[PDB]
């Protein structure tokens, strides 16, 4: 399955996943620090690591 | 953005 461009995790559905509209990585919302409510006031994502 | 949300 996909793992988590951060900590190497699963996917599993009762998380939030939010993806990187540059690096196209998946995420733990937990893990980039997103939640649902805050992805939604986001139109293109750019992760931690695509800030740098 | 794309995401998946909780079940
Ligand atoms: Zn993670
Ligand atoms: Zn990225």
Redesign the interface.
Same mark, same amino acid.
């Given at each position: 399955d996909t793992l988590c461009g951060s900590c190497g995790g699963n996917?599993t559905?009762?998380?939030? !996943? /939010?993806?990187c509209?540059v690096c196209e990585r !998946?995420y733990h919302?937990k893990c980039v620090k997103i939640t649902?409510a805050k992805?939604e006031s /986001?139109?293109?994502?750019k992760c931690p690591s695509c800030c740098t | 953005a794309r995401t998946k949300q909780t079940a």
């Open positions: 996917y559905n009762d998380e939030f !996943w /939010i993806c509209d !998946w919302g649902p992805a /986001i139109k293109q994502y | -």
